[PDB]
Design a binder for this molecule. Structure first.
Ligand SMILES: COc1ccc(CSC[C@H](NC(=O)CCCN)C(=O)NCC(=O)O)cc1
Ligand SMILES: COc1ccc(CSC[C@H](NC(=O)CCCN)C(=O)NCC(=O)O)cc1
Ligand SMILES: [Cl-]
Ligand SMILES: [Cl-]
Lengths: 221, 221
């Protein structure tokens, strides 16, 4: 066959959820790091990018852009997208809420500086009052180890990734959600995830000021 | 099975793409209009909104929130999500680019007054240089009447819907893109879509200042 090839810059950004999903599925991948605007232009000029943007993933003869297109494909291929159309609907509903919260956290450092205090507070309010309660409620309702179908799915993976980012933001926020804490523990002990969490995997660190500036350069924003 | 029931306010907003897809599929549906913050609060209190937000669609016993979850389910249910995983990947890539552009357009009236003109100019540059070229290129690649698999899919529907919104912004934007023009025409003449475009359907008008203010009251922004 061949290893999926992930085109992005050397940072979490919009590619990190794909790294998590592939790693969780046990799929070895290669990365080709964009180091400059000229590298990105080369991808564009070569016809690699449908909308002149990355992430792009080379997989199974396709050149897929758009995070959701990439993740949907990987999830379906590796049986992490539930068993039927109704389980998929629960998965999609859950992971779109996850993606909303993740997007708020992702973009926080590019908030206008004058807006940062209020928005961080609103993110924390939403975690405590909206998102964490929603997921805790799902887990409490069925009492099962996984979010959907009593079986590992992408929803468990995407959620637990987000829990690591929320921990980085403020380690107290999960304190009143024992079922989310338990899910974090369980999923982090699955062999593929536990390996990804260990030093040496493709897992990327928090984006520092420098890495963000590098993004600003490469992507012209 | 129940008739799908769409919960939203009486406007396009985030529910319009669902109205388009159900109508195109020939699926009869009902709408219950949120008229006040109090109506929204009742749906929230009563447990029907996973993330305390609408759109919400009651379909097949589910209370589905998140537009992409709703659309993914409807598309699968009505054979508008292609015929295999690789077709779904093209569809997803295409409709995510459509959603990106649609989101820019949706949010224009909520731009700070002094940023709006520049935002519109940027949207127009993206239409002409990024998005319309990408979709024209797809249509020219196979020369067929539909974007994917030589068969109607959700991609054709979401795209043509967007072409109507672009027309409202500036009827000149499509002028250099004859294949998109022709898709607009053909999809608009499909019996179901034709009927949806005619008066007295659930299709919603452009949101005016009065409807935007109602949104501000109901959703408290
Ligand atoms: C907060 O950290 C980051 C770092 C990088 C990015 C940009 S990701 C690269 C970008 N892709 C997209 O915006 C795709 C979104 C599709 N829904 C990109 O390629 N930008 C170049 C461009 O748009 O011209 C965002 C936040
Ligand atoms: C430009 O016109 C509009 C009109 C209404 C809306 C808001 S749609 C209702 C809103 N839902 C969401 O934001 C869902 C997004 C999930 N990806 C909502 O229910 N707001 C209430 C709240 O968030 O508390 C946005 C632009
Ligand atoms: Cl993306
Ligand atoms: Cl939504």
């Amino acid at each position: 066959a061949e290893k999926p090839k992930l085109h992005y810059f050397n940072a979490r950004g919009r590619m990190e959820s794909t790294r998590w999903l592939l790693a969780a599925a046990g799929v070895e991948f290669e990365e080709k790091f964009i180091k400059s605007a000229e590298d990105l232009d080369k991808l564009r000029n070569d016809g690699y990018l449908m909308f002149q943007q990355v992430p792009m993933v080379e997989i199974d003869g396709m050149k897929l852009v758009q995070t959701r297109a990439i993740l949907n494909y990987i999830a379906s291929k590796y049986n992490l997208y539930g068993k039927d159309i109704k389980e998929r609907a629960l998965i999609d509903m859950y992971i779109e809420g996850i993606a909303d919260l993740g997007e708020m956290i992702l973009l926080l450092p590019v908030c206008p500086p004058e807006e940062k205090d209020a928005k961080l507070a609103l993110i924390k309010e939403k975690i405590k009052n909206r998102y964490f309660p929603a997921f805790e409620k799902v887990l409490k309702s069925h009492g099962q180890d996984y979010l959907v179908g009593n079986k590992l799915s992408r929803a468990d993976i995407h959620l637990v990734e987000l829990l690591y980012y929320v921990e980085e933001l403020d380690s107290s926020l999960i304190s009143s959600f024992p079922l989310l804490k338990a899910l974090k523990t369980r999923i982090s002990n699955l062999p593929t995830v536990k390996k990804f969490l260990q030093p040496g995997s493709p897992r990327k660190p928090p984006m520092d000021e420098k890495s963000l500036e590098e993004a600003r350069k490469i992507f012209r924003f």
